[PDB]
Enzyme design. Structure first.
Site, short mmCIF file in Angstrom:
data_model
loop_
_atom_site.label_atom_id
_atom_site.label_comp_id
_atom_site.label_asym_id
_atom_site.label_seq_id
_atom_site.Cartn_x
_atom_site.Cartn_y
_atom_site.Cartn_z
N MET A 11 -6.29 23.69 -8.60
CA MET A 11 -6.23 22.37 -7.96
C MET A 11 -7.35 22.10 -6.96
O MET A 11 -7.14 21.46 -5.93
CB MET A 11 -4.84 22.13 -7.32
CG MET A 11 -3.71 22.05 -8.33
SD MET A 11 -3.88 20.65 -9.46
CE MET A 11 -3.50 19.27 -8.37
N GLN B 107 -5.95 11.04 -5.48
CA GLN B 107 -5.35 12.37 -5.82
C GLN B 107 -5.93 12.90 -7.13
O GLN B 107 -6.19 12.13 -8.06
CB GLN B 107 -3.82 12.26 -5.91
CG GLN B 107 -3.07 13.55 -6.28
CD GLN B 107 -3.30 14.70 -5.31
OE1 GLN B 107 -3.66 14.49 -4.15
NE2 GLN B 107 -3.09 15.92 -5.79
N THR C 147 -7.91 19.72 -3.87
CA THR C 147 -8.15 18.25 -4.02
C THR C 147 -9.15 17.74 -2.97
O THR C 147 -8.99 18.00 -1.78
CB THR C 147 -6.83 17.43 -3.93
OG1 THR C 147 -5.88 17.90 -4.90
CG2 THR C 147 -7.08 15.91 -4.16
N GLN C 148 -10.18 17.05 -3.45
CA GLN C 148 -11.15 16.37 -2.59
C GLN C 148 -11.34 14.95 -3.14
O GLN C 148 -10.50 14.44 -3.89
CB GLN C 148 -12.50 17.14 -2.56
CG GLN C 148 -12.45 18.66 -2.69
CD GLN C 148 -12.82 19.17 -4.08
OE1 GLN C 148 -12.44 18.58 -5.10
NE2 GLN C 148 -13.57 20.27 -4.13
#
Ligand SMILES: [Cl-]
Lengths: 240, 231, 244, 240, 243, 224, 111, 235, 241
Positions: free
Chosen positions: F107, G1, F1-2
């Site tokens: 992810m 997110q 995740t970024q």
């Protein structure tokens, strides 16, 4: 890790390390197993080259794997401890997951499988040990006697011997054991087991150990004097 | 002699004896023939039986819809390599939506075999493979040796007595290359080629194995009464 | 590859013997004699140092008798370095057991553990076995006083009196001749020293060539005391028993 | 690259000899003479700086090494093997000891740790033993002054005085005559210089001799290890 | 004796006989050459036509690394391919980190250290190939040749395989008769000739000529195969010179 | 995740009778800051494919290198690298699609929406979309982010269904694209006047046009 | 997110006849209120006379259909070109789907 | 010494060829395939009369449609059987069907060459894998330690094998009944067995489509032995 | 006799593989020499280009390890390059971890400790090379340190390596016996290079052209190798006096 293939085939189709393990068994002190109608008896030789021993604490030749199964052996003593430990662990693991103690055939099959594993794993030599595994299955009154050997084969025996001069005591048992009528009582079974050892042992009751296993976890080891009474009775009948 | 204990040891004349002994296992294997035109590519394989009660060992393996091989030597090694080809063909299809080029397939087999010849512990593959295929540059035939050497050819043969079939193809070269848009005539030439490597035994119905791939022909194997047409 | 240079330390001979175990026992046969004698009121450990110069600092020296815990000691015969590896392993097992059960380790359990380690080197791993034989002198509240020995094979046995190292054949006959079951520690001390005095390859047995120790419950309030004898004390007990 | 040497290169021969340890000792025998002497108020260790060339700067090659502030070491045999043992000895004196207890190890324990490393080269897979014998002199608060020897096997012995390498047999006999339990440190240095002169062929001066002491604290403490200067040695050679 | 049975073992000479035996496999292979020209390099190789069944122009021997380096080798062909696969990984990791395409001397040491690594242990076999390679970088043209030992040097001309002495003699004439330098198109012609002259050592079977080149002017510093008319022009030049 | 930092906006495209057109403005926004005015977001692969990329610019630059590297690797041991075994739009897309979905499934996505536009070996128009989730689709008109809302409605009036593709010429299609880019400049707050356009035709090949500008701008109704 | 899932709309319909079966699906692919494509096929011929659709999140759907199609190919290789029966296909799909039990294929699958 | 996976100069793996010698030393095992079923039979070969012969398990169930007989170092077969069983059950779990006999055999054979310096040596045991499936019907396979498997109409392995195979050569035809095959296995076992054939030193079994794989009772085999003796005395 | 194939002790207490690696050292048939000035350290080595096809610019056994450290190798080039690459890597890692340039002697000892490992561990062979490291250390001044296949290392006032090392060594020994100092008492490195070359000429009894030599010079804060023309200038000056 050390990966080296120690047990391998030779040009004539023999695995010498497995066969040389049998020679270590041949060297080992004699062990015998005789199953009666309602019992099994494990007889074992104790060599008298070792006196000044402390018999209270010296490792006994017959080992309990569970409260209903016993294991005696011939061959390397240090190697036997590894098979006994593994078997004892597997006995509790079986109770834990199946909620029932091992059958003698199952326990045998496991021990035999461990011996087999060491004959085709890298970096390890076979066990220099043959076992006699005896006892009674849970809620069963039929006696059970099995033999294993370094190669990993196992089988069921009415009576059997292994170790030094096992050829002689197997000769004796082959003529003296009747399958149609086995030793009906504990007395008869112990007597036939002591007799068979006296062919090779050639000495007193300190050199013979006896363990009687009966159904429903009823295992007892005979004392020197109890065995010595069988030795006295056998030779007094023999003088005739 | 002293330098044949493992694959990691060169001889004093620069030879790898374990590789050469693996090469020997191919010559002991049964004969199989490969040949192609511009439109089609054909494998013909003489299958070997243990005795009269036994089946005839399968020689031809399919790798994809457009590619497959015939084997000669250790069949389990052919299984390992064919499975490896199947995976590479499959990876090309899944990741690039692209049928694997036959030339690139050979390159992959070469390099897989090579690793076994330079490293201690292992062994060379004990099998030779004839890979046929039809890709974006037409029909192809490859000869794989377990040394690592892969070779694109118009026709060839490997196994016992394979030199007879190989000479025949060398003469017939100008004829069979021109059999375009005619699968049966190309198979006939392959069946006539493998016949030159026979002695004593002849081509029976459960003896002969034929495969074909081409322009509008997926890789398909013919065994049993399917090949009776060509006997 | 490497296979060319492998001794194969974990194989059987055609006769069914473990080559390296047998040769390690041959090594141990040349080591200085160590004797354990178990009496009704204690255990004696006696052992002979070897080579020895006048310049060896004896009072800070320990090649033979080592302490595993407060209840258990060992006498060593063989490679001192190999022994110290095994000793530090045994010292840990004793403390692991203490930590787990909050009770001191029983002597036989510790002995089995060490002997199982030794066994492992004979069956797998491709390494040379440990060239060491131990005499374990110890006490627990199940079996009381206990003597054991282990050897490179990983086999261990219990004893009333025993020798390891050099001249065990001669030593074991002399012990078998003069030992009795009702014997006491002070008598066993005398027997141990007399046995070494006869089996020694030296011209005479002196204090500087000996390590000596006793495990007595002979203490105030029935508790086990280990006494590793100091150089001056070994000299006194040699005069007491009348050897010098 | 697979380190396939997972098996011992030191094994028991039929006679019970460990060949490689014996051969490592032969290497030590060929090495230059070094010695150690223990006084009441100190220890001295000494060796010859055998210069490989006159163009070489022998000051850069330190045969006598500080392990801890109160422990010093000297050797006979293979220099590169010694160097890596000094490295490990210094490190283990921090990792397994100083970082735990907040103080440097006593002589005997550091010796034992070195001995352990040398033993492991005698049993581990794919290594030869170390080709050195060490002489470790040191002081600690509860044991006082001590001198130890450490051999390729991993065996170690405490000494009042001793010598190793080339002329060790002759040097030990020389020390046996001169040593007593009432030597002062200066008397021990005097004896060390005498003993070392016998084994040295060529030049005998402060530039060709390396000599260190474990003595009084040199100004938490000061370090007891002190390496004698080229000048300090020469001064004592005039009173020789 | 026994010093030649294991790789990475010094004989009492100071030699590693297993490497020297790998050289014999190289000497057994077909002829391959390299020619450094004004603004680039030319590679050429003898491809023995074992049979009429070999498809012409299909079994390509010269391999490209990155987009600017050409590699050719004599000896065990799979070992060459294995080395080029590694070279491609090295050239890729270099470009990934440093952005610029790998320089030829830099690339030469990457192969050199890897081949040398296979003389350090008995668990691996040395490479059965002398590898001639090079290309054009920011500092201009570079030709290298890399032996089984891990030895490599820069070259004006290079040659290996069964016809190496024949080739070397020819390369030495070119170096003497052209001190100011050889052009890229000249070097292609000369390469063709030298393979044809070096074919007298493999004269039993007929062969197939294969040439490639990097040149700053002729290929924009990229490795390309000499094809069609330019290949035929070089073959014609070579055929004329033998007659 | 970024999170995406420096970003590119709409990539728009359509099929026409002989090929495909793709276009994208030359801006690298840094949030509301119009930071980088010289960013090329159409990246050609060979002479038959253009990959248009929106979203995170650092991840675009990573994808740019992967494609550059893919060309190199395809050339290896490939005598037909400039002919029958050259890279196809479908190959290039499928690779990227595999990468995008693999990355989302770990992810750790490549924070982009991609349109691969090109022409195949057999002359077929290739136009397909893929994004950070690995979602793929094809349509006669494709547009990312903002263009999906404004460009597609306009472009679909020219090619509403498959049967309109053969009726649409390159001139009509190019006009429609340039018209759509103007509409986006008026209404997308994170767009720019300057853009690049690429035509991949089955006859005339790859035409890549740089430094184009939105013109014919109706502002005159503001003064009132 | 980062949300790894999405919704691409669509609707599919399987009906079993007495000696036939149909699997139908609309060809519209969407996200939120936008149309992505008016013709993006959703129901696939997977070989061995089996048709499949994995409606929901189109990426997870495509992934699954691709994996099953490949499973058919490898079933042929590994079991002598044996036809994958529809009941066997179904069980194979169960294991494909349950394989990602804790990071699900966000699709309602029908064969 | 020398590598475990080394090739001989003839192009054969030494260890594989030597394991084949071990299999020749094993007790005889015979398989006969028919259109009514496949029959498997073994020599038990008890080393002593005190060994309880019913505990000699040389015929084994893999699944309900697949049986297995063994010959050679029979201890080695336990892990092979285990694998075969796990493979059969695992495939039923993934595909809701019985596993093809060839596929099972192939799965067993994939273990065979997993040896080197994986296990340390090849298997010292050959298997006759008999079964039925819907695609290829009644099948008999011979699984060696080389990794190769042949299908057979009939096959003998072990100490009596070349003698038994020559006999099977003459006797087998495609129209054999199950009852005929049973007697034929008993006939050929009795020929090549050292000890005299009875119900306690020989075991029969079969695999039929209806009833699946069944090891025969000693009472059932005893009647077939008595039926054999009478039919051989009959001419 | 497998005690001669791997690095284990022979009965005499010897490692034959170490000894045979020392013989591989002279396989190149090249002689090197190193001397120290006041401000500098000069290393010279024979250059032999036997093949006319060789690019002579690539034929070098001198290596620039760091900016301050130079290394000349006596031995085969593959092992030389093995050693060079590792020494460069070690010198770079040192500067990163400890924040100052790796001293010459610290690198020598490091490379020596690595060489020692190959003499104790059986799977690794020793490298067939002798490594002469040179620098002008910021603490110790002009420095020469040498490593060999045994894992031995030591500092030098001057040194020589190769087949004819004994001749060069004794030639140097005799000069320093006269001057009674540890260095060449000279301000310019140019003249220290002239000394080095002159004393090799005298020792070997051979004249040199510009293409027969290879020269490396360490000064404070850089080590550099001289070009053919820089050496020619050096040879001219020698001839002219
Ligand atoms: Cl270091």
């Amino acid at each position: 890790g050390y990966d080296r293939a120690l047990s391998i085939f030779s040009p004539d189709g023999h695995i010498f390390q497995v066969e040389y393990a049998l020679e270590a068994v041949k060297r080992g002190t004699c062990a015998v197993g005789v199953k009666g109608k309602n019992c099994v008896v494990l007889g074992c030789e104790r060599r008298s080259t070792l006196k000044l021993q402390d018999t209270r604490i010296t490792p006994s030749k017959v080992s309990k794997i569970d409260s209903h199964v016993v294991l005696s052996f011939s061959g390397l003593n240090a190697d036997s401890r590894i098979l006994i430990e593994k078997a004892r662990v597997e006995a509790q693991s079986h109770r834990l997951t199946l909620e029932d103690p091992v059958t003698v055939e199952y326990l045998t099959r496991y021990v035999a499988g461990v011996q087999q594993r060491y004959t085709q794993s890298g970096g390890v030599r076979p066990f220099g040990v043959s076992t006699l595994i005896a006892g009674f299955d849970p809620r069963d009154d039929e006696p059970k006697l099995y033999q294993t050997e370094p190669s990993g084969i196992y089988s069921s025996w009415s009576a059997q011997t292994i170790g030094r001069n096992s050829k002689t005591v197997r000769e004796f048992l082959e003529k003296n054991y009747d399958r149609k009528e086995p030793p009906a009582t504990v007395e008869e079974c112990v007597k036939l087991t002591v007799r068979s050892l006296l062919e090779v042992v050639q000495t007193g009751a300190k050199n013979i150990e006896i363990t009687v296993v009966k159904p429903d976890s009823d295992i007892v080891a005979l004392s020197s004097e109890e065995i010595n009474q069988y030795v006295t009775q056998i030779e007094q009948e023999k003088q005739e | 002699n002293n330098y044949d204990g493992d694959t990691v040891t060169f001889s004093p004349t620069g030879r790898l004896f374990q590789v050469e002994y693996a090469l020997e296992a191919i010559k002991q294997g049964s004969v199989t023939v490969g040949l192609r035109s511009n439109t089609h590519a054909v494998l013909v394989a003489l299958k070997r039986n243990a005795d009269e009660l036994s089946s005839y060992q399968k020689k031809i393996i399919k790798c994809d819809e457009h590619m497959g091989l015939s084997l000669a030597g250790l069949a389990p090694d052919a299984r390992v390599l064919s499975n490896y080809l199947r995976q590479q063909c499959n990876y090309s299809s899944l990741v690039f939506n692209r049928k694997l080029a036959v030339e690139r397939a050979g390159h992959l087999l070469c390099d897989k075999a090579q690793k076994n010849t330079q490293s201690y512990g292992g062994r060379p593959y004990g099998v030779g493979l004839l890979i046929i295929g039809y890709d974006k540059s037409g029909a192809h035939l490859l000869e794989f040796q377990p040394s690592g050497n892969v070779t694109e050819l118009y026709g060839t043969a490997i196994g016992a007595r394979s030199q007879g079939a190989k000479t025949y193809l060398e003469r017939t070269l100008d004829t069979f290359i021109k059999i375009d848009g005619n699968p049966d005539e190309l198979i006939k030439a392959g069946v006539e080629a493998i016949s030159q490597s026979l002695r004593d035994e002849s081509l029976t119905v459960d003896n002969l194995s034929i495969a074909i791939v081409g322009k509008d022909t997926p890789f398909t194997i013919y065994d049993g009464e399917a090949v009776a047409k060509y006997i | 590859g490497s296979r060319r240079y492998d001794s194969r330390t974990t194989i059987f001979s055609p006769e069914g013997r473990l080559y390296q175990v047998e040769y390690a026992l041959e090594s141990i046969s040349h080591a200085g004699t160590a004797i354990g004698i178990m009496a009704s009121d204690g255990i004696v450990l006696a052992a002979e140092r070897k080579v020895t110069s006048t310049l060896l600092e004896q009072d800070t020296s320990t090649e033979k008798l080592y302490k595993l815990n407060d209840k258990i000691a060992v006498a060593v015969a063989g490679l001192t370095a190999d022994a110290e590896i095994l000793i530090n392993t045994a010292r840990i097992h004793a403390q692991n057991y203490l930590k787990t059960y909050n009770e001191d380790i029983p002597v036989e359990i510790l002995v089995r553990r060490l002997s199982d380690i030794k066994q492992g080197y004979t069956q797998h791993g491709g390494l040379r076995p440990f060239g060491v034989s131990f005499i374990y002198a110890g006490y627990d509240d199940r079996y009381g006083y206990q003597l054991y020995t282990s050897n490179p094979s990983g086999n261990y046995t219990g004893w009333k009196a025993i020798s390891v190292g050099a001249n065990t054949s001669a030593a074991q006959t002399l012990l078998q001749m003069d030992y009795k079951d009702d014997m006491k520690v002070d008598d066993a001390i005398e027997l141990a020293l007399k046995t070494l005095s006869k089996t020694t390859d030296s011209s005479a047995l002196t204090y500087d060539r000996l390590e000596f120790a006793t495990i007595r419950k002979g203490a105030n309030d029935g508790e086990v005391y280990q006494k590793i004898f100091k150089p001056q004390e070994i000299k006194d007990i040699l005069v007491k028993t009348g050897i010098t | 690259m697979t380190d396939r040497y997972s098996f011992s290169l030191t094994t028991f021969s039929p006679s019970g000899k460990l060949g490689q340890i014996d051969y490592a000792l032969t290497a030590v025998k060929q090495g230059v003479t070094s010695l150690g002497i223990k006084a009441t108020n100190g220890v001295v260790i000494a060796t010859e700086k055998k210069s490989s060339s006159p163009l070489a700067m022998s000051e850069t090659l330190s045969k006598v090494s500080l392990l801890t502030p109160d422990i010093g070491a000297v050797y006979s045999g293979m220099g590169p093997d010694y160097r890596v043992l000094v490295d490990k000895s210094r490190k283990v004196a921090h990792t397994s000891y100083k970082r735990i207890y907040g103080e440097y190890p006593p002589t005997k324990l550091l010796v034992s740790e070195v001995a352990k490393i040398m033993q492991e080269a005698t049993q581990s897979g794919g290594v030869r033993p170390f080709g050195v014998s060490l002489l470790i002199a040191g002081h600690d608060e509860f044991n006082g002054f001590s001198l130890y020897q450490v051999d390729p096997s991993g065996s170690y012995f405490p000494w009042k005085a001793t010598a190793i390498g080339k002329g060790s047999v002759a040097a030990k006999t020389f020390l046996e005559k001169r040593w007593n339990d009432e030597l002062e440190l200066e008397d021990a240095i005097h004896i060390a210089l005498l003993t070392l002169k016998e084994s040295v062929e060529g030049e005998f001066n402060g530039d060709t001799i390396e000599l260190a002491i474990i003595g009084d604290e040199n100004p938490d403490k000061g370090p007891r290890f002190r390496k004698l200067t080229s000048q300090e040695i020469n001064d004592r050679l005039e009173a020789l | 004796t026994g010093y030649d049975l294991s790789n990475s073992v010094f004989s009492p000479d100071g030699r590693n006989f297993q490497v020297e035996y790998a050289v014999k496999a190289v000497e057994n292979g077909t002829t391959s050459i390299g020619i450094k020209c004004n603004d680039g390099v030319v590679f050429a190789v003898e491809k023995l036509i074992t049979s009429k069944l070999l498809v012409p122009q299909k079994n390509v021997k010269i391999q490209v690394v990155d987009r600017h380096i050409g590699c050719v080798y004599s000896g065990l062909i799979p070992d060459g391919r294995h080395l080029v696969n590694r070279g491609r990984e090295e050239a890729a990791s270099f470009k990934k980190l440093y952005k610029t395409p790998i320089p030829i001397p830099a690339f030469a040491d990457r192969l050199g250290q890897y081949v040398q690594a296979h003389t350090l242990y008995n668990s691996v076999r040395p490479f059965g190939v002398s590898t001639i390679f090079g290309g054009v970088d920011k500092n201009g043209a570079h030709l290298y040749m890399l032996e089984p030992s891990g030895s490599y040097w820069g070259y004006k001309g290079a040659a290996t395989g069964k016809g190496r002495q024949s080739a070397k003699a020819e390369l030495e004439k070119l170096v003497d008769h052209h001190p100011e330098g050889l052009s890229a198109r000249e070097a292609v012609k000369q390469a063709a000739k030298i393979i044809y002259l070096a074919h007298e050592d493999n004269k039993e079977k007929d062969f197939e000529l294969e040439i490639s080149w990097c040149s700053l002017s002729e290929t924009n510093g990229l490795h390309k195969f000499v094809k069609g008319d330019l290949l035929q022009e070089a073959i014609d030049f070579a055929q004329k010179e033998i007659n | 995740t970024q999170q995406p930092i420096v970003t590119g906006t709409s990539v728009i495209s359509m099929k026409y009778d002989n090929g495909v057109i793709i276009a994208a403005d030359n801006l690298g926004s840094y949030g509301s800051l119009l930071r980088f005015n010289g960013v090329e977001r159409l990246i050609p692969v060979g002479d038959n494919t253009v990959v248009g990329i929106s979203g995170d610019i650092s991840d675009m630059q990573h994808i740019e290198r992967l494609l550059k590297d893919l060309v190199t690797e395809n050339a290896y041991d490939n005598p037909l690298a400039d002919a029958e075994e050259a890279l196809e739009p479908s190959y290039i897309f499928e690779y990227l699609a595999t990468v995008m979905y693999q990355r989302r499934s770990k992810m750790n996505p490549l924070w982009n929406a991609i349109i691969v536009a090109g022409v195949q070996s057999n002359g077929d128009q290739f136009l397909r979309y893929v994004n950070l989730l690995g979602v793929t689709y094809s349509s006669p008109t494709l547009a990312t982010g903002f263009g999906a809302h404004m460009a597609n409605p306009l472009l679909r009036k020219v090619v509403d269904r498959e049967s309109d593709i053969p009726k649409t010429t390159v001139q009509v299609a190019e006009e429609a694209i340039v018209n759509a880019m103007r509409v986006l400049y008026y209404r997308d707050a994170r767009s720019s006047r300057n853009f690049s356009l690429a035509i991949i035709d089955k006859n005339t090949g790859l035409t890549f046009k740089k430094n184009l500008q939105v013109e014919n701008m109706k502002w005159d109704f503001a003064k009132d | 997110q980062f949300n790894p899932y999405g919704d691409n709309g669509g609707t599919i319909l399987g009906i079993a006849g007495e000696d036939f079966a149909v699997l139908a699906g609309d060809t519209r692919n969407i996200t939120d209120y936008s149309i992505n494509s008016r013709y993006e096929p959703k129901v696939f011929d997977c070989g061995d006379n089996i048709v499949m659709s994995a409606n929901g999140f189109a990426a997870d759907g495509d992934a699954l259909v691709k994996r099953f199609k490949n499973s058919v190919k490898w079933y042929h290789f590994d079991h002598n070109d044996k036809k994958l029966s529809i009941n066997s296909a179904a069980r194979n799909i169960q294991h494909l789907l349950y394989g990602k039990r804790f990071f699900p294929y966000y699709v309602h699958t029908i064969i | 010494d020398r590598g475990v996976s080394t090739f001989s100069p003839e192009g054969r793996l030494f260890q594989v060829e030597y394991s084949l010698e071990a299999i020749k030393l094993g007790s005889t095992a015979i398989g006969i395939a028919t259109k009514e079923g496949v029959v498997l039979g073994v020599e038990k070969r008890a080393t002593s009369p005190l060994l309880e012969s019913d505990s000699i398990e040389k015929i084994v169930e893999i699944d309900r449609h697949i049986g297995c007989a063994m010959s050679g170092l029979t201890a080695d077969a336990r892990s092979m059987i285990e694998h075969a069983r796990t493979a059969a059950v695992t495939h039923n779990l993934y595909y809701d069907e019985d596993i093809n006999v060839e596929s099972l055999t192939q799965s067993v054979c994939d273990l065979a060459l997993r040896f080197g310096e994986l296990m340390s040596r090849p298997f010292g045991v050959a298997l006759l894998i008999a079964g039925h499936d819907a695609d290829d019907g009644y099948q008999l396979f011979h699984a060696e330690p080389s990794g190769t498997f042949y299908r057979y109409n009939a096959k003998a392995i072990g100490s009596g094998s070349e003698g038994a195979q020559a006999e099977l050569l003459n006797e087998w035809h495609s129209s054999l009944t199950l009852k005929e095959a049973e007697l034929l296995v008993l006939k050929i076992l009795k020929q090549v067995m050292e000890e005299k054939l009875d119900e306690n030193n020989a075991q029969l079994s079969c695999i039929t489509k209806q009833d699946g794989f069944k090891i025969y009772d000693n009472e059932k085999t005893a009647e077939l032995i008595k039926e054999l003796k009478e039919k051989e005395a009959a001419e | 006799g497998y005690d001669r194939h791997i690095t284990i002790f022979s009965p005499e207490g010897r490692l034959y593989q170490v000894e045979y690696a020392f013989k591989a050292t002279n396989q190149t048939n090249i002689n090197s020499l190193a001397v120290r000035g006041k401000d500098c350290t000069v290393v010279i080595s024979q250059k032999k280009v036997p093949d006319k096809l060789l690019d002579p610019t690539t034929v070098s056994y001198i290596f620039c390890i760091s900016r301050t450290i130079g290394m000349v190798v006596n031995g085969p080039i593959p092992d030389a390059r093995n050693a060079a690459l590792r020494a460069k890597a070690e010198a770079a890692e040192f500067r990163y971890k400890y924040g100052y340039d790796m001293p010459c002697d610290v690198l020598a000892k490091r490379m020596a400790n690595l060489s020692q490992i190959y003499t104790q561990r059986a799977y690794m062979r020793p490298l067939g090379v002798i490594l002469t490291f040179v620098s002008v250390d910021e603490e110790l001044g002009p420095s020469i340190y040498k490593t060999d296949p045994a894992g031995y290392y030591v500092g030098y006032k001057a040194t020589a390596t190769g087949p004819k090392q004994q001749e060069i060594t004794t030639n140097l020994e005799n000069h320093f016996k006269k001057s009674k100092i540890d260095h060449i008492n000279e301000e310019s490195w140019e003249k220290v290079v002239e000394f080095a070359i002159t004393h090799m000429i005298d020792a070997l009894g051979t004249e040199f052209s510009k293409n027969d030599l290879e020269v490396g010079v360490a000064t404070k804060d850089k080590f550099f190798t001289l070009s053919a023309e820089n050496i020619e200038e050096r040879l001219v000056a020698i001839a002219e006096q």
